[PDB]
Amino acid sequence: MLSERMLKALNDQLNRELYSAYLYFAMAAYFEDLGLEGFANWMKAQAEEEIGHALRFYNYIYDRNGRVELDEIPKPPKEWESPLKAFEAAYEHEKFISKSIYELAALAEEEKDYSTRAFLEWFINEQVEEEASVKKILDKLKFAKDSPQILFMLDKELSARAPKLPG
């Protein structure tokens, strides 16, 4: 039902999703420390969305009667030069996740694993939204090159998005 090769790669992705959660929580802390509460809440909601991605892997592995196994989660970076650089890193990160999803799709394909392929489909479309939504902001941060005024109003727009777990 799941080859050893595929199970290990899905567990590997599960771990990648969790480190993604961790990495955005890291950016949340970096944004609080700049006093940008909107930016930080956005990143906290990103963090939660990634845990959701991890749970989708967890559920899928169990549906295929496999076994989840958790690995260490590396310490993430502490700091970035500017909000723009933080979003450059988030975007570098989004692309690295897309890539790792494509690799998994190739692998399900190479192994003729239809089910796992169909499951990955949801992440292919989801990664389109992720990259786009981070790009939208990275670009706004460029267009606010030297303007604390726009930065301030950006921070306000990003506060629409809120972590659900405090509830």
Backbone angles phi, psi at 106, to 5 degrees: -65, -40
CA distance 75 to 89: 15
The single residue among 4, 81, 110, 166 that binds its own copies, judged by CB under 8 A, is 166
CA distance 117 to 119: 5
Does the footprint of its own copies cover residue 35 (CB under 8 A)?
yes
CA distance 124 to 127: 5
CA distance 99 to 59: 22
Does the footprint of its own copies cover residue 89 (CB under 8 A)?
no
93 annotated among ligand-binding-site residues = no
User: Which residue carries 């990955």 as its tokens?
Assistant: 120
CB of 97 to Fe ion, least distance (A): 5
129 annotated among ligand-binding-site residues = yes
Closer residue to Fe ion in complex, CB, 17/155? 17
Does the footprint of its own copies cover residue 164 (CB under 8 A)?
yes
CA–centroid distance for 91 within its chain: 9
CA distance 59 to 82: 37
CA distance 103 to 124: 11
49 annotated among ligand-binding-site residues = yes
Does the footprint of Fe ion cover residue 16 (CB under 5 A)?
no
Query: Interface with Fe ion by CB under 5 A: which residues?
Result: 17, 50, 53
Chain residues binding its own copies by CB under 8 A are 1, 22, 25-26, 29, 32-33, 35, 37, 48, 51-52, 55, 58, 60, 62-65, 67-76, 78, 98, 101-102, 105-106, 112, 114-115, 118-119, 121, 124-125, 127-129, 131-132, 135-136, 139-140, 143-144, 147-150, 152-153, 164-167
